[model samples]
Target: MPHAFKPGDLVFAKMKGYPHWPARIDDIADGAVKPPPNKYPIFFFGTHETAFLGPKDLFPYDKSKDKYGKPNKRKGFNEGLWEIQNNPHASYS
Candidate 1:
Protein backbone atom coordinates (compact mmCIF):
# COMPACT_ATOMS: atom_id res chain seq x y z
CA MET A 1 0.00 0.00 0.00
CA PRO A 2 1.07 3.60 -0.60
CA HIS A 3 0.36 4.69 2.97
CA ALA A 4 1.28 2.50 5.92
CA PHE A 5 -1.35 4.01 8.23
CA LYS A 6 -5.14 4.05 7.74
CA PRO A 7 -8.20 5.14 9.67
CA GLY A 8 -8.74 3.18 12.91
CA ASP A 9 -5.11 2.05 12.98
CA LEU A 10 -3.09 2.34 16.20
CA VAL A 11 0.20 4.22 16.46
CA PHE A 12 2.63 5.67 18.96
CA ALA A 13 1.78 9.34 18.59
CA LYS A 14 4.31 11.95 19.63
CA MET A 15 4.02 15.35 21.28
CA LYS A 16 6.23 17.98 22.89
CA GLY A 17 7.66 16.97 26.33
CA TYR A 18 5.52 13.81 26.32
CA PRO A 19 7.48 11.62 23.92
CA HIS A 20 5.05 8.75 23.17
CA TRP A 21 1.35 8.08 23.56
CA PRO A 22 -0.84 5.18 22.42
CA ALA A 23 -3.38 6.74 20.10
CA ARG A 24 -5.60 5.80 17.18
CA ILE A 25 -4.92 6.98 13.62
CA ASP A 26 -7.11 8.90 11.19
CA ASP A 27 -7.09 9.46 7.43
CA ILE A 28 -3.84 10.81 5.97
CA ALA A 29 -3.94 13.83 3.68
CA ASP A 30 -2.17 17.02 2.72
CA GLY A 31 -2.84 19.77 5.26
CA ALA A 32 0.13 21.89 4.37
CA VAL A 33 0.77 24.66 1.85
CA LYS A 34 2.25 24.19 -1.65
CA PRO A 35 5.04 22.16 -0.03
CA PRO A 36 5.19 18.40 -0.56
CA PRO A 37 3.72 17.82 2.89
CA ASN A 38 1.25 15.27 4.27
CA LYS A 39 -0.26 14.81 7.72
CA TYR A 40 -2.27 12.45 9.85
CA PRO A 41 -4.89 13.00 12.53
CA ILE A 42 -4.23 11.56 15.97
CA PHE A 43 -7.18 10.87 18.27
CA PHE A 44 -5.99 10.07 21.79
CA PHE A 45 -7.97 7.46 23.71
CA GLY A 46 -6.04 8.53 26.84
CA THR A 47 -8.30 11.55 26.62
CA HIS A 48 -11.15 12.55 24.30
CA GLU A 49 -8.79 14.79 22.34
CA THR A 50 -6.98 14.96 19.00
CA ALA A 51 -4.16 16.58 17.02
CA PHE A 52 -2.64 16.55 13.52
CA LEU A 53 0.90 15.22 13.08
CA GLY A 54 3.31 14.35 10.32
CA PRO A 55 4.31 10.78 9.38
CA LYS A 56 7.74 11.16 10.96
CA ASP A 57 6.06 12.04 14.25
CA LEU A 58 4.39 8.63 14.51
CA PHE A 59 5.75 5.13 15.06
CA PRO A 60 4.25 1.65 15.29
CA TYR A 61 3.04 1.16 18.87
CA ASP A 62 5.60 -0.93 20.76
CA LYS A 63 3.55 -3.90 21.94
CA SER A 64 6.58 -5.28 23.80
CA LYS A 65 6.23 -2.56 26.43
CA ASP A 66 3.02 -4.22 27.65
CA LYS A 67 4.76 -6.99 29.54
CA TYR A 68 2.07 -9.43 30.77
CA GLY A 69 3.10 -9.40 34.40
CA LYS A 70 0.08 -10.05 36.58
CA PRO A 71 -2.77 -12.37 35.73
CA ASN A 72 -5.93 -10.47 36.79
CA LYS A 73 -7.31 -13.05 39.20
CA ARG A 74 -10.69 -12.31 40.72
CA LYS A 75 -11.43 -13.15 44.38
CA GLY A 76 -14.79 -11.50 45.02
CA PHE A 77 -15.23 -12.27 48.70
CA ASN A 78 -11.56 -13.02 49.23
CA GLU A 79 -10.22 -9.69 47.99
CA GLY A 80 -13.41 -7.88 49.14
CA LEU A 81 -14.86 -6.49 45.91
CA TRP A 82 -18.39 -7.59 46.89
CA GLU A 83 -20.29 -10.56 48.22
CA ILE A 84 -23.36 -12.41 46.94
CA GLN A 85 -24.47 -14.09 50.19
CA ASN A 86 -23.41 -11.30 52.56
CA ASN A 87 -24.79 -8.60 50.31
CA PRO A 88 -28.22 -9.27 48.89
CA HIS A 89 -29.57 -7.33 45.90
CA ALA A 90 -31.82 -4.41 46.86
CA SER A 91 -34.28 -3.21 44.23
CA TYR A 92 -35.05 0.38 45.30
CA SER A 93 -36.46 1.33 41.94
Candidate 2:
Protein backbone atom coordinates (compact mmCIF):
# COMPACT_ATOMS: atom_id res chain seq x y z
CA MET A 1 0.00 0.00 0.00
CA PRO A 2 1.11 3.55 -0.67
CA HIS A 3 2.14 5.57 2.36
CA ALA A 4 2.11 9.30 2.97
CA PHE A 5 5.22 9.14 5.13
CA LYS A 6 8.86 9.30 4.14
CA PRO A 7 12.09 8.95 5.96
CA GLY A 8 13.02 11.80 8.36
CA ASP A 9 9.45 13.00 8.37
CA LEU A 10 8.37 14.42 11.68
CA VAL A 11 5.38 12.38 12.84
CA PHE A 12 3.47 11.00 15.78
CA ALA A 13 3.38 7.35 16.81
CA LYS A 14 0.87 5.78 19.15
CA MET A 15 1.87 2.64 20.97
CA LYS A 16 -0.42 0.19 22.64
CA GLY A 17 -1.16 1.25 26.21
CA TYR A 18 0.49 4.57 25.50
CA PRO A 19 -0.26 8.02 24.25
CA HIS A 20 0.48 9.42 20.83
CA TRP A 21 4.05 10.60 21.08
CA PRO A 22 5.89 12.73 18.59
CA ALA A 23 8.72 11.15 16.66
CA ARG A 24 10.63 11.27 13.42
CA ILE A 25 10.28 8.65 10.78
CA ASP A 26 13.53 6.83 10.34
CA ASP A 27 12.67 4.18 7.81
CA ILE A 28 10.19 1.65 6.60
CA ALA A 29 10.70 -2.06 7.00
CA ASP A 30 8.93 -4.95 5.26
CA GLY A 31 10.96 -8.02 6.10
CA ALA A 32 8.27 -10.59 6.76
CA VAL A 33 10.57 -12.73 8.85
CA LYS A 34 11.65 -9.88 11.04
CA PRO A 35 10.02 -9.00 14.35
CA PRO A 36 8.37 -5.91 12.96
CA PRO A 37 7.08 -7.69 9.91
CA ASN A 38 5.84 -4.45 8.42
CA LYS A 39 6.35 -1.31 10.43
CA TYR A 40 8.07 2.04 10.58
CA PRO A 41 11.11 2.84 12.68
CA ILE A 42 10.82 6.01 14.71
CA PHE A 43 12.94 8.25 16.92
CA PHE A 44 11.19 10.01 19.77
CA PHE A 45 11.79 13.52 20.98
CA GLY A 46 12.99 14.63 24.51
CA THR A 47 14.29 11.08 24.83
CA HIS A 48 16.49 8.78 22.79
CA GLU A 49 14.02 5.92 22.60
CA THR A 50 13.90 4.03 19.35
CA ALA A 51 10.80 2.05 18.42
CA PHE A 52 8.65 0.78 15.61
CA LEU A 53 4.98 1.49 15.34
CA GLY A 54 2.42 0.14 12.92
CA PRO A 55 1.69 2.33 9.90
CA LYS A 56 -1.88 2.65 11.08
CA ASP A 57 -0.65 4.13 14.31
CA LEU A 58 1.67 6.68 12.79
CA PHE A 59 0.36 10.05 11.64
CA PRO A 60 1.54 13.45 10.52
CA TYR A 61 2.73 15.48 13.48
CA ASP A 62 1.02 18.64 12.31
CA LYS A 63 -2.32 16.86 12.65
CA SER A 64 -0.94 14.81 15.46
CA LYS A 65 -2.97 12.94 18.05
CA ASP A 66 -0.48 13.87 20.69
CA LYS A 67 -0.05 16.48 23.38
CA TYR A 68 3.68 15.98 23.67
CA GLY A 69 6.12 18.26 21.97
CA LYS A 70 8.33 16.94 19.18
CA PRO A 71 11.75 17.64 18.00
CA ASN A 72 12.11 19.66 14.86
CA LYS A 73 12.00 17.81 11.60
CA ARG A 74 15.39 16.41 10.86
CA LYS A 75 15.15 16.89 7.13
CA GLY A 76 18.81 15.92 6.88
CA PHE A 77 19.06 13.24 9.55
CA ASN A 78 16.48 10.61 8.74
CA GLU A 79 19.42 8.30 9.11
CA GLY A 80 18.17 5.81 11.74
CA LEU A 81 16.72 2.36 12.46
CA TRP A 82 13.50 0.31 12.44
CA GLU A 83 10.40 -1.65 15.66
CA ILE A 84 6.97 -2.29 14.57
CA GLN A 85 3.63 -3.06 16.19
CA ASN A 86 1.06 -5.89 15.94
CA ASN A 87 3.87 -8.24 14.99
CA PRO A 88 6.07 -10.74 16.73
CA HIS A 89 8.70 -9.09 18.87
CA ALA A 90 12.18 -10.27 19.65
CA SER A 91 12.45 -12.32 22.79
CA TYR A 92 13.32 -10.31 25.87
CA SER A 93 16.47 -11.55 27.52
Candidate 3:
Protein backbone atom coordinates (compact mmCIF):
# COMPACT_ATOMS: atom_id res chain seq x y z
CA MET A 1 0.00 0.00 0.00
CA PRO A 2 1.28 3.47 -0.84
CA HIS A 3 1.85 5.70 2.18
CA ALA A 4 1.28 9.39 2.74
CA PHE A 5 4.66 9.70 4.41
CA LYS A 6 6.64 12.89 3.95
CA PRO A 7 10.26 13.72 4.64
CA GLY A 8 11.07 14.10 8.36
CA ASP A 9 8.28 11.80 9.40
CA LEU A 10 9.41 9.26 11.96
CA VAL A 11 8.77 5.75 10.75
CA PHE A 12 9.77 2.23 11.73
CA ALA A 13 11.45 -0.03 9.21
CA LYS A 14 12.01 -3.74 9.47
CA MET A 15 15.38 -4.62 7.99
CA LYS A 16 15.90 -8.19 6.91
CA GLY A 17 17.52 -10.34 9.63
CA TYR A 18 17.44 -7.33 11.96
CA PRO A 19 14.78 -5.98 14.24
CA HIS A 20 12.74 -2.90 13.43
CA TRP A 21 14.60 0.41 13.70
CA PRO A 22 13.40 3.99 13.71
CA ALA A 23 14.03 5.81 10.44
CA ARG A 24 12.87 9.04 8.88
CA ILE A 25 11.52 9.45 5.41
CA ASP A 26 14.25 11.22 3.49
CA ASP A 27 12.82 10.99 -0.01
CA ILE A 28 10.23 9.09 -1.90
CA ALA A 29 10.77 7.70 -5.37
CA ASP A 30 9.03 9.85 -7.94
CA GLY A 31 9.70 7.72 -11.04
CA ALA A 32 12.46 10.17 -11.94
CA VAL A 33 14.62 8.33 -9.42
CA LYS A 34 14.97 4.63 -8.94
CA PRO A 35 15.73 2.63 -5.83
CA PRO A 36 17.36 -0.78 -5.54
CA PRO A 37 15.17 -3.71 -6.39
CA ASN A 38 12.17 -3.90 -4.08
CA LYS A 39 13.18 -0.97 -1.92
CA TYR A 40 12.01 2.53 -1.07
CA PRO A 41 13.87 5.66 0.02
CA ILE A 42 14.43 6.52 3.69
CA PHE A 43 16.85 8.24 6.03
CA PHE A 44 17.62 7.07 9.52
CA PHE A 45 16.99 9.83 12.06
CA GLY A 46 19.72 9.18 14.63
CA THR A 47 22.39 8.30 12.06
CA HIS A 48 21.41 10.62 9.20
CA GLU A 49 21.92 7.54 7.04
CA THR A 50 19.99 6.80 3.89
CA ALA A 51 18.73 3.62 2.27
CA PHE A 52 16.04 2.08 0.12
CA LEU A 53 13.54 -0.26 1.65
CA GLY A 54 10.66 -2.34 0.45
CA PRO A 55 7.52 -0.32 -0.14
CA LYS A 56 5.66 -1.88 2.75
CA ASP A 57 8.63 -2.06 5.08
CA LEU A 58 7.84 1.17 6.87
CA PHE A 59 5.24 1.98 9.50
CA PRO A 60 4.39 4.93 11.72
CA TYR A 61 6.80 5.31 14.65
CA ASP A 62 4.92 6.16 17.81
CA LYS A 63 7.04 8.09 20.29
CA SER A 64 4.76 6.87 23.05
CA LYS A 65 5.97 3.30 22.54
CA ASP A 66 9.10 1.37 21.57
CA LYS A 67 9.91 -1.43 19.19
CA TYR A 68 9.37 -3.87 22.03
CA GLY A 69 5.96 -2.34 22.75
CA LYS A 70 7.36 -0.80 25.94
CA PRO A 71 5.78 2.48 26.92
CA ASN A 72 8.69 4.67 28.02
CA LYS A 73 10.77 7.67 27.01
CA ARG A 74 14.18 5.96 27.00
CA LYS A 75 15.11 3.64 24.19
CA GLY A 76 17.14 0.55 25.01
CA PHE A 77 20.76 -0.16 24.15
CA ASN A 78 22.54 -3.13 22.69
CA GLU A 79 24.82 -5.30 24.78
CA GLY A 80 27.93 -4.17 22.93
CA LEU A 81 30.35 -5.06 25.72
CA TRP A 82 29.15 -8.63 25.73
CA GLU A 83 29.50 -8.83 21.98
CA ILE A 84 33.06 -7.46 22.07
CA GLN A 85 34.01 -9.86 24.84
CA ASN A 86 32.82 -12.77 22.71
CA ASN A 87 34.38 -11.47 19.52
CA PRO A 88 37.20 -9.06 20.11
CA HIS A 89 38.14 -8.61 16.50
CA ALA A 90 34.52 -8.16 15.48
CA SER A 91 33.54 -4.67 14.31
CA TYR A 92 31.49 -3.56 17.25
CA SER A 93 32.35 0.06 16.60
Top TM-score prediction, candidate number: 2
- Stretches of candidate 2 exceeding 4 Å from the true structure: 1-3, 27-35, 65-93
Candidate with better lDDT, 1 vs 2:
2
Please list the residue runs of candidate 1 whose C-alpha ends up more than 4 Å from where it truly belongs after superposition. 1-3, 27-37, 62-93
lDDT, candidate 2, 1-93, per-residue tens: 545666767666767865566567664357622327567676665344678766787777555533433333443122211212211133211
lDDT digits (tens) for residues 1-93 of candidate 1: 245776766565667865355555654447723323466667654343568887777765444125311222422212211211122222111
Candidate 2, residue 14: how far the Cα is off, in Å: 0.3
For lDDT, candidate 2 versus 3, the one ahead is 2
Error of 1 at 39 (Å): 0.8
lDDT of the candidates, in the order given: 0.48, 0.53, 0.51
Superposition error at 53 for model 3 (Å): 1.4
TM-score of each: 0.51, 0.53, 0.49
What lDDT is reached at residue 77 by model 3?
16
- C-alpha-based local distance difference test score of model 1: 0.48
Candidate with the greatest lDDT versus the true structure: 2
Local error of candidate 1 at 52, Å? Answer: 0.2
